[PDB]
C-alpha cells in the first residue's frame, strides 16, 4: 500500500533542490551541504576525497534515514579557505580522477586485445 | 619552560598481571636517579616496547615550549610554532587524582599522581619536590623517546 | 526504565575498552552522527606518531553537561579493592566519570542498564529531561555507526 | 525445624560495647502450622 | 568530634585567620561541641530505628554527588587549606533545615 514508488530513490520532483548550502553557527568556518536523492555511493567519495586535502579540518557525512534519500555533508576549513570551494576543488579533482582512470583502462583494454 | 617533570626511566616488566588487552600493555618502570616508580599503560602495535628498554619521560602543560596555553583543540595546520616534535611518541590526558603520604599534621613525603589519557593511565610514585608542578584537574601532555 | 540495550550495549563494551582507536576519519564519521556535539574535535589522546582518538573520549564527547559517575564493571575483581591498583584497575574496572568527561573503565548492564545509580539515572537526576532524550539518541546512533 | 541462620535478617544483631554492630549466630526455630499465643507464652521464648 | 587539641593538623586544614578564631572565642568551641552531642544522640536514634545494620536507605538528595559536583564546579583543590568557618557551616545547615 505505501511501498514507495521505486523511481522515487533517485529522481526529483517538482519542489525541491538538489543543493542546499547552510552556514553553521557553532563553529566559524563551516557548511553544511545537503545533497538530495543521493546515498553513500556519492557520500563516501566526497568524504574520503575531502579528507585528503591538506587544509581542511572536518570532513564527514551521514544519512539522516536510510529510507529518506537523503545525505548531509559537514566541511570545515582554516580561516582563509571558504568551505564551498574546497567542494568544488574536491569535485574537479575527482572529475580529473575518474576521466585519467577511464582512458588509462581503455589503454589497457586495447593493450589485452592483441 | 612548562616542563612539568624531566626523568629517565627503564623497563622491568612487560606485564606483570597478564596480557589483559591486545594493544594495550602495562609497563612497570623505575628511574635511575630520582627513584620513582612508574606504572603506565602504551599502545603496543603503534609503538613497540620490550624489557630493558631505556627512555626518558617528560610531562609538559604545552607543547609549544613557549608557556602559552593551548586551550585544547585539535589544529594539525599550527605546526608554526614548532611545538615539542622531537620525541617519538606523543600521548594528552588529564590528571584526576593525587594521592600521598599525608597525615593528619605531617605533610605529605611521597606523592603519588595518577593520569588519564583517554583511558590509558599512569602512577607516578615520586618524592613531593618533583611533584608539586601537578594540579588536579589539570591537562597534561606524555613524551617518549627511545635511548641507545 | 530506560535503558541501552541490545547491539547498542554491546557495541558500547568494545567501543569503551581500553584497547579500540580510531583514525581520523573514523572519528569525523562518528562525530558527524552526533547532535549535541559543540563542533570542536577534542585533542586527541595520541599525537604521535599518528592521531588516534580513543573510544572513551568519543564517548566523553557523548556525556551531556558535568556528571559525576562511578561504577564497577560486571567483571570487577573483589582483589582490586583491597589491595594496590585500586584506582588503576588494570582489568580497567570501575567506571569513573569526572566532569562529564569519562575517565575508566567498561560499561555494561550495570553502567547504562535499568539499574538504579546508572549513568542515565544521574544524567535524567542533573541535567533534566531533553538533554537525557538527546543523550540516549546520541548513544545510539553513534554506537549503531 | 533447627538450624543456625546465614542471613543477616534472621541473625542476632546487638549494640557492643565498643558500639559496633556485631553478627551473632543464635539458634532459631521456624515450626510448621501457627500457635502463636501459645508458643508467646511459652518458657523460654522470646516475646519480642 | 573535630578534635582541635593538636591544632596542627587544624591549621593545616584551615587558614590563619580561621584558625586563631578557632582556637579562641570559647563561644565557638561550645557550639561545635553542642553539634556533636547532637550529632551523638541523633547517632543513637538512627540505631534504635535501624537493626541488622541496614545502612542502604532511600532519600531524595544524593548529597555525596552534590558535593563532589560542587567540588568539580568550582575546581576546589582539596590539597590546600579552604577558607570555611565550621559555624559558617553549622548555621546554614541549620537555616537550610
Known amino acids: 500500500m505505501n511501498a514507495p514508488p521505486a523511481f522515487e530513490s533517485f529522481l526529483l520532483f517538482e519542489g525541491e533542490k538538489k543543493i542546499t548550502i547552510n552556514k553553521d553557527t557553532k563553529v566559524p568556518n563551516a557548511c553544511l551541504f545537503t545533497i538530495n536523492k543521493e546515498d553513500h555511493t556519492l557520500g563516501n567519495i566526497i568524504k574520503s576525497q575531502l579528507l585528503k586535502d591538506p587544509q581542511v579540518l572536518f570532513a564527514g557525512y551521514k544519512v539522516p534515514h536510510p529510507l529518506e534519500h537523503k545525505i548531509i555533508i559537514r566541511v570545515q576549513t582554516t580561516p582563509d579557505y571558504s568551505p564551498q570551494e574546497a567542494f568544488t576543488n574536491a569535485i574537479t579533482d575527482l572529475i580529473s580522477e575518474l576521466s585519467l582512470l577511464e582512458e588509462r583502462f581503455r589503454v589497457a583494454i586495447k593493450d589485452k586485445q592483441e | 619552560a612548562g616542563i612539568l617533570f624531566e626523568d629517565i626511566f627503564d623497563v622491568k616488566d612487560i606485564d606483570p598481571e597478564g596480557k589483559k588487552f591486545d594493544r594495550v600493555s602495562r609497563l612497570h618502570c623505575e628511574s635511575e636517579s630520582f627513584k620513582m616508580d612508574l606504572i603506565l599503560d602504551v599502545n603496543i602495535q603503534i609503538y613497540p616496547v620490550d624489557l630493558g628498554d631505556k627512555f626518558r619521560l617528560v610531562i609538559a602543560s604545552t607543547l609549544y615550549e613557549d608557556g602559552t596555553l593551548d586551550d585544547g583543540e585539535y589544529n594539525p595546520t599550527d605546526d608554526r610554532p614548532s611545538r615539542a616534535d622531537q620525541f617519538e611518541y606523543v600521548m594528552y590526558g588529564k590528571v584526576y587524582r593525587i594521592e600521598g603520604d599525608e597525615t593528619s599534621t605531617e605533610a605529605a613525603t611521597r606523592l603519588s599522581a595518577y593520569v588519564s589519557y583517554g583511558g590509558l593511565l599512569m602512577r607516578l610514585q615520586g618524592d613531593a619536590n618533583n611533584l608539586h608542578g601537578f594540579e588536579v584537574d589539570s591537562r597534561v601532555y606524555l613524551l617518549m623517546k627511545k635511548l641507545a | 526504565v530506560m535503558g541501552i540495550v541490545q547491539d547498542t550495549l554491546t557495541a558500547v563494551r568494545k567501543f569503551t575498552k581500553r584497547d579500540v582507536f580510531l583514525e581520523r576519519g573514523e572519528v569525523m564519521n562518528l562525530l558527524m552522527f552526533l547532535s549535541t556535539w559543540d563542533g570542536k574535535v577534542p585533542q586527541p589522546a595520541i599525537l604521535k606518531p599518528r592521531p588516534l582518538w580513543t573510544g572513551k573520549q568519543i564517548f566523553s564527547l557523548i556525556i551531556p553537561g558535568h556528571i559525576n559517575c562511578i561504577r564497577t564493571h560486571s567483571t570487577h575483581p573483589d582483589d582490586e579493592d583491597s589491595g594496590p591498583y585500586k584506582h588503576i584497575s588494570p582489568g580497567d574496572t570501575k567506571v569513573v566519570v569526572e566532569n562529564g568527561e569519562l575517565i575508566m573503565g567498561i560499561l555494561c548492564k550495570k553502567s547504562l542498564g535499568t539499574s538504579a545509580g546508572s549513568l542515565v539515572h544521574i544524567s535524567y537526576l542533573e541535567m533534566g529531561h531533553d538533554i537525557t532524550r538527546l543523550f540516549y539518541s546520541n548513544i545510539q546512533t553513534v554506537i549503531n555507526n | ?48 | 568530634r573535630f578534635d582541635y587539641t593538636n591544632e596542627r593538623a587544624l591549621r593545616r586544614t584551615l587558614q590563619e585567620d580561621l584558625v586563631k578564631d578557632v582556637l579562641s572565642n570559647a563561644h565557638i568551641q561550645n557550639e561545635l561541641e553542642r553539634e556533636f552531642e547532637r550529632m551523638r544522640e541523633d547517632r543513637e536514634v538512627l540505631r534504635v530505628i535501624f537493626p541488622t545494620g541496614d545502612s542502604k536507605v532511600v532519600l531524595p538528595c544524593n548529597l555525596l554527588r552534590m558535593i563532589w559536583n560542587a567540588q568539580k564546579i568550582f575546581h576546589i583543590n582539596p590539597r590546600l587549606p579552604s577558607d570555611l568557618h565550621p559555624i559558617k557551616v553549622v548555621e546554614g545547615v541549620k537555616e537550610l533545615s
Open chain 4, 1 to 48: 525445624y533447627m538450624h543456625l541462620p546465614q542471613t543477616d535478617n534472621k541473625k542476632k544483631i546487638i549494640i557492643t560495647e565498643d558500639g559496633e554492630f556485631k553478627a551473632l549466630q543464635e539458634w532459631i526455630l521456624e515450626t510448621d502450622g501457627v500457635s502463636l499465643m501459645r508458643v508467646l507464652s511459652e518458657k523460654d521464648v522470646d516475646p519480642v
